[PDB]
């Protein structure tokens, strides 16, 4: 019926839940208009369609680990929670995960979903091949090794190349992670010490309510002195939640307690499992150089942000070569905004935000809200012409192109 | 707002999600009318209230394992999926789980939730102590060792004693379980071999559509073959109890050994339905009336199968818990996962109840039924005892909604 | 003390007439205890150093329309404070039995009325200003000091001398009050909850002679006990036999202003129990009614809502109040209380801090979850133990 | 989001763009607080509101000409760029145009926007009637002919009467205009020859950087040479490209591709602040010299200043109410803090010349004094209360400056 938040009521005629590869290939082939439905953790109409919603949650939850190549072959309908548990048990890990694990692996990689860390990509960077059902109904495989020229536009694809059934991931050895929350770092500390703070851990989040002159929280996640303590931030005495009033229970165990990578790198614990959300979201991704400038630009309109914000989160993400990846050929600073659920009021505040950041050539998070018109947005991605070439090659009728992918990427 | 099936719209004024014991104690105390809210996997008006709905999902998720006594202190908002995973990690298990893990431990035990298994009781049986917030707002502990007279009425409580915050669970060593599905057993094979079948593994499920003369599926889970010999054929790939639904949802089959918490339920940890498209009722009968009852239903299989997804038949050992459906009688379980027409199932239930009447059938407290109070109560010895415990720990009836008033507490 | 069973062993009795003067006295005196009205019955207000009244201070009463709160002199009595609050068209939720009781003295001990959804008077407090042992002002408020403010109000005057308390107000309201005579004692076994909920504030008066509740006072904001066999009173009544009805607030259902209705207007003990033990307790007490009734004027049963104030008797549990206005024979009463505390022990009872009791410390401290937090707040605000007498040392602070 | 400059961040709740009169009238009637948004070419908080910002650029762009009366009925949301090009096509013209065409007609007229020329008023004088949606949502027409007592209040209104949908303009025959730039006139030239200079063309503009005592540039626009006695494409600001500006070097062209300084195609956000003071024309030289005396404080934080002339009108809050006028315009550099210092000073040195500020550009002139400098303000306050008792269309700006006691 709706997206996780419940602001997007899907206008689809039918919701198909194929129980096999064969049953999917039939649904895709016979349907004139398809958009794959993963986890519903998007806030825009990217997943909307007047035709066929198709889930892949009901296919085999394959997770075949090849010990020789250190790579897992895994079902696109599978979520990061499950995938991680299974990978971890077998003694394998991924380099990073998003804020909660209950997010669909293909759905995440489609929109350029990311964690934080200076030397760590968006999650799609771990992908080394896809198999997808084309608009026709047959399996195509695109892999880095085999298809150098085409693979990089395959992964962060807005699910407009077809339905991905199995993604190959490069694995690392399973690892332990400790996480501490520091409170009330002074905002001015960023002006001279931004690079030192975000490098002070494997993955660092800044949380600010854009009220006053203080970074409300700083989450410093280390692979097994703290810099942000030196700079005025006090360690938190107990468990904490990024948002004011929301329970610490939900969140991954903090207070410096080492635990497995997959119960630490996300902000939310394997158990949390919210059936629904009461928030909106927008995230702008800038070149890393514009962090401070951009911080200040936003400091200038904090009086419009703070009223309708739950929390804003600031992260770093290494550059990839993935054509519609927000991290395409530029190390990045992430300006995320978990809003309160008033779309009208957030839409005003986003047009404004987009004006004050415009000098920093900001790319919006494909899954989160934005108002950046196509002309401007397309100019901010070099390889947008090469991706439109691949979408017409693999989907000439534009089966997998709803209004959103047309408007933002495909239409002239 | 609603139950997981969505047939029950809670008519509550407030939905509290306290983040601390203190915050809970304040909400309980100040609210003149409370019903706790766990996982929402009930289908009747048990969890409904005009007063204050109260989750405990927001309290610290304690799983404190005490190696010495081999027990686990666990938060009442926690669900079996999370609890199990954590218990398994530390190298511990429980004896049984329900069909899907993502059910709340306090809400499961509060209704008499159960698996299958000859020598295995309802899940509430692994409970040795409960700490709860009284209608007053203070903590009370009831344990088997400290309160032998009263503890047996406190676990399977319909949440009418107050809000349980922690539950002590006797553990076992973590164990491996293999699972095999068998297809199209002859219905007559039960008549002389029911007990031989249900005992053919640690936990055993019979799934029939109540169409014609076959048992669609038989699931035989073993701690690390009868029904083959009796004319059922091994399934060659993965399978789901209901026709149409995907095998993918379900725990790994084909006799492949796995961890207990990834086998004893039908549904794998990853399957996480946010909503359901079904109703439910389950009748629990003394084991001797298995065949007698099997036939008595077969006599109205023409009114069942129309509005039915699948019916599940299981065994449950006896316990001593006053409102447990397995209260001092080894049990045969007749489960019905209906299709979501409440008006139509209610009519089929009136009937089911009438034909099963001679077997003194106790309904599952969480699932649908229409068995009136007078009759329901007479099927429970220790109903007068529970009514006293409620009055002792909740004189004002704070935790007594119209459901618990009408079925157990009112005269 | 207003009873006269406690002779204050203080060297000096100061009555500062200015904040400045009070601040001086506190600073210069190495041992202080504040004196309200003297409506305690125990050794709580007693000290060998300096008694300090605050009755002479400016009776400030600053009603802030916006937040709907008042700022009032700790020395002010509820009678006086009420009259002023009422004239401005404001009220407090509840008042104790007589208004001529000091506001900071009341809140320090866990003073309370009756009412199912009504707290002790200390719950109406949002902030305190108090002179420390050093002579400077500290403000503790709920808003500004979440962690600490709950130890501060019901304090046993062991943190400093409170000068001004901020109260949350309601709109001023009328109240009617009817006394019913001779309810059957059995009527509580099934209808306790229904009776105590039959008004805004309800009181049960029993002489613990036979099986009758002598009187039941039912106070309503502008019904069960009539139907359960108690008869309406023909004319004005007083809770104690023989004492004149003239002393008591107007009854016979004549609507009146809250402050002329919620109060009713000897030694005293009160035990405060989880509300669920109301009937169980009421029997345990009937089971020694032969030792009570001889030395008793009247006993008063009331209900009080839970709060989060660390040494409130209502700390984290709705409450049934069992009060005993005794005949002034302390030696006799101390025998009765020792037995009473034994029969009531299973109901984990808390004593009214400002009334008599013999519950040993080790036990009394285990019936308060947040004693250690209150002990660390007194050592934070008064490390010298200026405001620590023998009472507060014995019961709460000493190790 | 912001005004064209970006110094004003709109603190509105809703930004509406009605696509019909019906839809506007609905937005107005249901909104308790409204301010219309034109082109955002203001620099103060005149357009600002905590209520409802309402563009009109999405209504029918009507341009209904009556050959008989030689008058056009035009959509308020229309810009001078568009409106001109369509007026011209039909073989009609307006007497004058502001510096660029991409300013909203009703936005222009609401603040008393103007060009240069001795015998031509501010743009608002060409308006003979308005239809506006009241705070109730119904249409009211005020016209000079029908409502003599009230109409003069209605045009230069500060958008405080209602939302103007259609304005009736008096038109002329379409005319050609040539313009020429002369460079470095001596400032002393003005001392005896100001009047002769500003009368030397249809419109004349004097650009000075307020460095020394020269006029950097004199733009002389003639319908189809005095400043020569006392020649150059060129941009009024140092460092900005000439290509942005209308075609000069005496090349004849249509009025609308000429009278503005900036060509139909430019279409730029901005990087400047603005103030303009409008003095009775006789104080030209006295004021020019009074400013030359603090030209040390000005020239630093200045792009360019423009001095122009404007005819008198009878429009109640027109800067040109009952007096021929000399315009001292300043395009400042974007440092509001620095400019607000210079304006307190400028407003003191010009005080004897009874200056009126441009309603659309910056000023620090206190209300009591500003109000004294308009005779008819008492009558505009009586009209606003007549058309908008609840003050739906009155923001902080209009209340502070004009309406509040
Ligand atoms: C609570 C929450 C936390 C979040 N945390 C983070 C975070 O920390 N970092 C971050 O970067 N983002 C984060 N996000 C954003 C989120 O990762 C994106 O919205 C994500 O891309 C949505 O994935 P989905 O599958 O849930 O959503 P959907 O709307 O269901 O799908 C997203 C897109 O993927 C496509 N897709 C899905 N499955 C397939 C498939 N098999 N083949 C092809 N295309 C497919 C769909 O067509 C659609 O276009 C968060 C979102 C939420 C709600
Ligand atoms: C998909 C599905 C699968 C199922 N599988 C099985 C199965 O295999 N076997 C079986 O026997 N049953 C099964 N059931 C039935 C189910 O276990 C019961 O309805 C059970 O009561 C679920 O409780 P809940 O907390 O999830 O729901 P709720 O309606 O929220 O809670 C049930 C009761 O528990 C009480 N409660 C919850 N938390 C507390 C607490 N902390 N303190 C006090 N009271 C509390 C509530 O007040 C309420 O009265 C299943 C149900 C579904 C929907
Ligand atoms: C006739 C009568 C009726 C009563 N009715 C009730 C009733 O209905 N309900 C009930 O609960 N109790 C009742 N009580 C008990 C009485 O209200 C309490 O004992 C109360 O706490 C005493 O207040 P006081 O002004 O007499 O203080 P005192 O006995 O003089 O002092 C008691 C405490 O107050 C402290 N104190 C006083 N002022 C300050 C200050 N400004 N700053 C710091 N500490 C201060 C002292 O330090 C001391 O610890 C009654 C008592 C009597 C005599
Ligand atoms: C680059 C530039 C050049 C300029 N050149 C000149 C110039 O040469 N001469 C000159 O005199 N001024 C000039 N100005 C100033 C400008 O002409 C005035 O500030 C003008 O009033 C603003 O027009 P706008 O449409 O941007 O108004 P806005 O800022 O959008 O709003 C201004 C006022 O118009 C009102 N309004 C707009 N439309 C309506 C309507 N339909 N009904 C009712 N009220 C309405 C608004 O409520 C507000 O009170 C210039 C400004 C800039 C930025
Ligand atoms: O990263 C995200 C969402 O993309 C979350 O951390 C939010 O910041 C809310 O906590
Ligand atoms: O039998 C049960 C227990 O309630 C179900 O979970 C089965 O899968 C039938 O749907
Ligand atoms: O309120 C009290 C004391 O708390 C009553 O006992 C009255 O004094 C009547 O005796
Ligand atoms: O905008 C105006 C008038 O308001 C012009 O003076 C420009 O500054 C020319 O550069």
DSSP string, C320-332: EEEEEEE-S-HHH
**Chain A contact partners (≥3 CB pairs within 8 A):** B, D
Residue A287 β-bridge partners = A332
Q: Is D351 in CB contact (< 8 Å) with chain A?
A: no
Sole residue written with tokens 């696509």: D19
A67: number of Cβ within 10 Å: 10
Question: What's phi and psi for B90, nearest 5 deg?
Answer: -80, -10
* Minimum CA–CA partner of B17 in chain A: A247
Q: Chain centroid to CA A285: how far?
A: 11
Residue D222 to chain A, least CA–CA distance (Å): 41
Question: Phi and psi (nearest 5°) for A234?
Answer: -90, 130
With beta carbons under 8 A apart, name residues in chain A contacting D37: none
Cβ-contact A84, A94 below 8 angstroms: yes
Alpha helices in chain C (DSSP H): 19-28, 78-87, 103-109, 149-152, 187-196, 278-286, 289-292, 330-344, 361-366, 371-381, 390-392
Output phi, psi for C294, to 5 deg: -55, -45
d(CA D351, CA D148): 32
Is the distance from CB of B28 to CB of B34 less than 8 angstroms? yes
| B26 in contact with C, Cβ within 8 Å | yes
Pick the CATH number of B176-371 from 3.30.70.2520, 3.30.70.2470, 3.40.50.2000, 1.10.10.60: 3.30.70.2520
What is the dihedral sign for C-alpha A329, A332, A338, A344? Answer: negative
What are the Cα distances from residue D136, in Å, to D46, D154, D163?
A: 22, 17, 11
Distances (CA, A) of B97 to A11, B276, C71: 39, 19, 59
Tokens 């200015």 found at: C18
Q: Does A have 3 or more CB contacts under 8 Å with D? A: yes
Ligand 7 pocket test: pick from C238, C239, C247, C351 the residue with the most ligand atoms within 8 Å of its Cβ.
Answer: C239
Which of B246, B272, B275 is closest, CB to CB, to A17?
B246
What Cα–Cα distance (Å) separates residue D318 from each residue in B410, D31, D100, D284, D323? 82, 28, 20, 19, 10
Burial status of residue B404 (CB atoms within 10 A of its CB: 0-12, 13-18, 19 or more): buried
Q: Which two tokens stand for residue D253?
A: 């062209």
Residues from chain B contacting residue A275 (CB–CB below 8 Å): 274-275
Q: Is the dihedral of CA C390, C391, C393, C394 positive or negative?
A: positive
Q: How many angstroms separate the alpha carbon of residue A330 from the centre of ligand 2?
A: 51
CATH for C61-172 is 3.30.465.10
Pairwise CB contact (< 8 Å): B29 & C306: yes
Final resolution, Å: 2.4
- Cα B317 from Cα D61, distance rounded (Å): 82
d(CA A128, CA B24) in angstroms, rounded, equals: 49
A230 interfacial to chain D (CB closer than 8 Å):
no
Length of chain B: 411
The residue among A117, A138, A115, A191 whose CA lies nearest residue A24 is A138
Q: Is the CB of D36 under 6 A from ligand 4?
A: yes
- CATH 3.40.30.10 applies to domain A178-370: no
Contacts with D31 (C-beta within 8 Å, 6 or more apart), sequence order: D14, D51, D52, D54, D392
Query: Would you report the helix, strand and coil content of chain B in percent, each value rounded to 5?
Result: 30, 25, 45
Beta-bridged to residue D304, according to DSSP, are D331
State the Cα–Cα distance between residues A112 and B385, nearest whole angstrom: 60
The gap from C-alpha A311 to its chain's centroid, in whole angstroms, comes to 17
Helix (H, G, I), strand (E, B) or coil at C119: coil
Instruction: Return the SS3 of B399.
Output: coil
DSSP B306: G
- Residues of chain B positioned with their CB less than 8 A from the CB of A251: none
Nearest CA in chain B to C276: B395
Helix (H, G, I), strand (E, B) or coil at A402: coil
A-chain residues near D14 (CB < 8 A):
344, 348
Crossing angle, helix B290-298 and helix B189-198, to 10 degrees?
130
Asked if D14 reaches chain A (Cβ–Cβ under 8 Å), the answer is yes
Q: State the chains in contact with C (3 or more Cβ–Cβ pairs under 8 Å).
A: B
Going from the Cα of D369 to the center of ligand 1, the distance in angstroms, rounded, reads 61
Distance of alpha carbon C118 from alpha carbon C173, whole angstroms? 15
Fill in the DSSP letter of residue C356: B
> What residues contact residue B123 under an 8 Å CB cut-off, 6+ apart?
B80, B94, B96, B97, B98, B105, B108, B109, B113, B114, B115
Centre a 10 Å sphere on the Cβ of residue B237 and count the other Cβ atoms it contains. Answer: 9
3-state secondary structure at position D331: strand
Q: Under a CB-based contact definition with an 8 Å cutoff, are residues D380 and D146 in contact? A: no
What is the rounded distance in angstroms from the CA atom of residue D49 to the CA atom of residue D36?
A: 10
Q: Where are the domains of chain B?
A: 63-174, 176-371
Nearest CA in chain B to A75: B248
CB A204 within 8 Å of CB A219 = yes
Q: What is the CA radius of gyration of chain B?
A: 20
Q: Which fold has domain D176-368?
A: Alpha-Beta Plaits (3.30.70)
In chain C, how many H helices and how many E strands?
11, 19
Chains that touch B (3 or more CB pairs under 8 A): A, C
Q: In terms of Cα–Cα distance, which of A99, A134, A151 is closest to A321?
A: A151
Residues 6 or more apart whose Cβ sits within 8 Å of residue B246: A17, A19, A58, A59, B240
Q: Residue written as tokens 């006090």?
A: A234
Q: Which chains touch D (3 or more CB pairs under 8 A)?
A: A
Q: What span, in angstroms and rounded, lies between the C-alpha atoms of A195 and A159?
A: 34
Q: Are B80 and B97 in contact (CB under 8 A)?
A: yes
Tokens describing residue C230: 């108690």
Answer yes or no: are the C-beta atoms of B179 and B219 closer than 8 Å: yes
Residue A57 near chain B (CB below 8 Å): yes
> How far apart are alpha carbons D253 and D224 in whole angstroms?
10
Number of Cβ atoms within 10 Å of the Cβ of D137: 17
B399, B159 in Cβ contact below 8 A? yes
- For residue D243, how many other CB atoms are within 10 A of its CB? 10
Compare all CA atoms of chain D with the CA of A304 and give the residue at the minimum distance.
Answer: D11
| Cα C303 from Cα C283, distance rounded (Å) | 17
CA dihedral defined by B359, B184, B115, B37, rounded to 10 degrees? -90
Q: Classify domain D14-55 at the CATH class level.
A: alpha beta
Among B28, B136, B147, B160, the strongest candidate for a mutation testing the C interface, having the largest count of C CBs within 10 A, is B136
The Cα-based distances of C162 to B380, C48, C84, C130, C376 in angstroms read 60, 20, 20, 4, 19
The encoded tokens of residue A89 equal 């048990």
B410 in C contact zone (CB under 8 Å): no
Region of residue B383 (phi > 0: left; psi between -120 and 50: alpha; otherwise: beta): alpha
First-residue to last-residue Cα distance in chain D: 31
Angle at B187 (CA atoms; ends B185, B191), nearest 5 degrees: 115
Please list the residues that pair with A281 across neighbouring strands.
A338
Minimal C-alpha gap between B375 and chain A (Å): 38
Between CA C354 and CA C365, with CA C360 as vertex, the angle to 5 degrees is 80
> Kind of pairing, strands D273-280 and D325-332?
antiparallel
CA separation for the pair C19, A366 (Å, rounded): 64
Return the DSSP state at B11.
-
Based on the number of CB atoms within 10 Å of its own CB, is A259 exposed (0-12), middle (13-18) or buried (19 or more)? middle
The torsion of the CA quartet D188, D194, D200, D201, rounded to 10 degrees, works out to: 110
**Whose CA is closest to A36, among A23, A20, A22, A52?**
A52
Under 8 Å between Cβ of D220 and D179: yes
Helices vs. strands in chain A: H and E counts, helices first: 11, 19
Nearest to B183 by CA among B210, B219, B211: B219
Residue C334 and residue B141: Cα distance in Å, rounded?
33
Among the listed residues D328, D314, D310, the one whose alpha carbon sits nearest the alpha carbon of residue D151: D314
**Hey, what are A180's tokens?**
């501490």
Residue with tokens 């240069």: D116
Q: Give the number of A-D residue pairs with CB atoms closer than 8 Å.
A: 19
Q: Are B179 and B221 in contact (CB under 8 A)?
A: yes
DSSP classification of residue A278: -
Residue A272, classed as helix, strand or coil, is coil
Q: What's D362's DSSP letter?
A: -
Whether C274 and B30 lie within 8 Å, measured CB to CB: no
Interchain proximity D11–A304, CB inside 8 Å: yes
What gap in Å lies between CA C156 and CA B106, rounded to an integer? 41
Q: Is A19's CB within 8 Å of B247's CB?
A: yes
Q: Angle at which helices B290-298 and B342-356 pack, to 10 degrees?
A: 130
Beta strands in B104-147 (DSSP E): 127-133, 139-143
Q: In this structure, what token pair is assigned to residue D189?
A: 């030239």
Q: Which tokens sit at B21?
A: 């014991």
Is the CB of D6 inside 8 Å of chain A's CB atoms? yes
D2: which strand partners? D9
- Phi (first) and psi of residue D88, to 5 degrees: -65, -55
**The two three-digit tokens of residue A168, written as one number:** 């190959």
Residues 6+ away with beta carbon under 8 Å from C397: C158, C375, C378, C385, C388
- Give the span between the Cα atoms of C354 and C349, in whole angstroms: 15
Q: Which atom of ligand 1 is nearest to the CA of A3?
A: 29
Which residue matches tokens 């091949």? A129
Biggest alpha carbon–alpha carbon distance for chain D? 62
Residue A381 C-beta-side C-alpha neighbours within 13 Å: 28
DSSP three-state, residue B265: coil
In chain A, residues preceding a discontinuity (C to N beyond 2.5 A) are 224
Strand partners, C202: C218
Interface of C with B in 104-143 (CB under 8 A): 116-117
Whether A304 and chain D come into contact, CB under 8 Å, resolves to yes
Could you give the CA distance from residue B362 to residue B369 in angstroms, rounded to a whole number? Answer: 10
Tell me the two tokens of residue B238: 């993965």
In Å, how far from its chain's centre is CA D67? 28
β-sheet bridge partners, residue C63: C70
* Tokens linked to C338: 């020792």
Which has the closest alpha carbon to A105: A36, A17, A167, A37? Answer: A167
Residue B134 is classified by DSSP as -
Torsional sign, CA D333, D338, D341, D345 = negative
- The residue whose C-alpha atom lies closest to atom 8 belonging to ligand 7 is C97
Q: Measured between alpha carbons, how far apart are the two ends of chain A, in Å?
A: 31
Residue-by-residue DSSP string for D149-204: TTHHHHSS-TT-S-EEEEEEEE-EE--EEEEEEEEEEETTHHHHHHHHHHTSSSEE
Closest CA to C55 of C32, C80, C28, C91: C80
Q: Which of C258, C232, C244 is nearest to C82 (CA)?
A: C258
CA of B332 to the centre of ligand 6 (A): 15
Which residues sit opposite D179 in a β-bridge? D221
Question: Given CA atoms C359, C362, C365, C371 in this order, what sign does their dihedral have?
Answer: positive
- How many CB atoms are located within 10 Å of the residue A248 CB? 18
Instruction: Report the half-sphere exposure of A253 (CA within 13 A, side-chain side).
Output: 17
**Rounded Cα–Cα distance for residues B136 and B35 (Å):** 14
Contact D281, D366 (CB under 8 A): no
CATH class name, domain B63-174? alpha beta
Whether B29 and chain C come into contact, CB under 8 Å, resolves to yes
Give the list of residues 6+ apart from residue B151 with CB closer than 8 angstroms, or none: B129, B142, B143, B144
DSSP string, C231-271: EEPSS---SSTTS-GGGS---TT--EEGGGTSS---EEEEE
So what's the architecture of C174-358 in CATH?
Answer: 2-Layer Sandwich (3.30)
- Tell me the C-alpha distance between A339 and A337, whole Å: 6
Per-residue 3-state assignment (H helix, E strand, C coil) for chain A: CECCCCCCECCCCEEECCCCHHHHHHHHHHCCCEEEECCCCCCCCCCCCCCEEEECCCCCCCEEEECCCCEEEEECCCEHHHHHHHHHHCCEECCCCCCCCCCEHHHHHHCCCECCCCCCCEHHHHEEEEEEECCCCCEEEEECCCCCCCHHHCCCCCCCCCEEEEEEEECEECCEEEEEEEEEEECCHHHHHHHHHHCCCCEEEEEECCCCCEEEEEEEEEECCCHHHHCCCEECCCCCCCCCCCCHHHECCCCCCCEEHHHCCCCECCCCCCCCCCCEEEEEEEEHHHHHHHHHHHHCCHHHHHHHEEEEEEEEECCECCCCCCCECCCEEEEEEEECCCHHHHHHHHHHHHHHHHHHCCEECCCCCCCCCHHHHHHCCCCHHHHHHHHHHHCCCCCCCCHHHHHHHHCC
What does the angle CA D92 – CA D96 – CA D99 come to, to the nearest 5 degrees? 125
The region, left, alpha or beta by phi > 0 then psi within -120 to 50, assigned to residue C316 is left
DSSP reduced 3-state for A82? helix
What lies within 8 Å, CB to CB, of B37 at 6+ separation is B10, B15, B47, B53, B54, B55
CA nearest ligand 7 atom 1, residue: C97
- CATH fold of the domain at D63-174+377-403: 3.30.465
Which CATH topology does C12-53 take?
Answer: 3.30.43
Query: Half-sphere exposure of residue C38, counting CA atoms within 13 Å on the CB side?
Result: 13
Dist. CA A360 → ligand 1 center (Å): 25
Contact A320, A328 (CB under 8 A): yes
């Amino acid at each position: 019926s709706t997206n996780w938040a419940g602001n997007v009521v899907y206008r689809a005629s039918e919701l198909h839940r194929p129980a096999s590869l064969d049953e999917l290939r039939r649904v895709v082939a016979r349907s004139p208009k398809v958009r794959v439905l993963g986890s519903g953790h998007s806030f825009n109409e990217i997943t909307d369609t007047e035709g066929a919603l198709v889930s892949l949650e009901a296919l085999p939850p394959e997770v075949e680990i090849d010990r020789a190549t250190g790579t897992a072959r895994v079902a696109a309908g599978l979520r990061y929670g499950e995938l991680s548990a299974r990978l971890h048990a077998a003694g394998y890990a991924l380099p990073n995960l998003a804020s909660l694990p209950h997010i669909c692996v293909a759905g995440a990689c489609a929109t350029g979903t990311h964690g934080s860390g200076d030397g760590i990509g968006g999650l799609a960077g771990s992908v080394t091949a896809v198999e997808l059902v084309t608009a026709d109904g047959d399996l195509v495989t695109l892999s880095r090794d085999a298809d150098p020229d085409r693979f990089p536009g395959a992964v962060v694809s807005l699910g407009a190349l077809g339905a991905v059934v199995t993604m190959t991931l490069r694995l690392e050895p399973a690892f332990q992670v400790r996480q501490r929350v520091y409170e009330n770092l002074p905002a001015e500390a960023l002006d001279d010490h931004f690079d030192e703070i975000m490098a002070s851990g494997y993955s660092v989040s800044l949380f600010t309510d854009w009220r006053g002159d203080r970074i409300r929280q700083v989450w410093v996640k280390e692979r097994v002195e703290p810099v942000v303590a030196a700079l005025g931030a006090t360690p938190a005495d107990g468990p904490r939640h990024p948002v004011p009033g929301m329970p610490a229970a939900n969140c991954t165990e903090q207070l410096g307690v080492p635990g497995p990578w997959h119960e630490r790198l996300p902000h939310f614990r394997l158990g949390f499992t919210p059936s629904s959300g009461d928030e909106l979201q927008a995230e702008y991704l800038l070149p890393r150089r514009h962090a401070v400038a951009a911080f200040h630009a936003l400091a200038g309109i904090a009086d419009r942000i703070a009223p309708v914000l739950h929390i804003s989160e600031i992260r770093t993400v290494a550059a990839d070569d993935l054509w519609l990846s927000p991290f395409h050929g530029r190390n990045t600073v992430a300006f995320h905004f978990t809003w309160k659920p008033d779309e009208a009021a957030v839409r005003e505040v986003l047009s404004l935000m987009e004006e004050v950041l415009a000098p920093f050539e900001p790319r919006p998070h494909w899954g989160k809200l934005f108002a950046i018109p196509p002309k401007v947005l397309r100019s901010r991605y070099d390889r947008i012409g090469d991706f439109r070439a691949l979408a017409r090659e693999l989907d000439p009728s534009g089966k997998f192109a709803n209004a959103f992918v047309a408007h933002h990427v495909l239409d002239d």
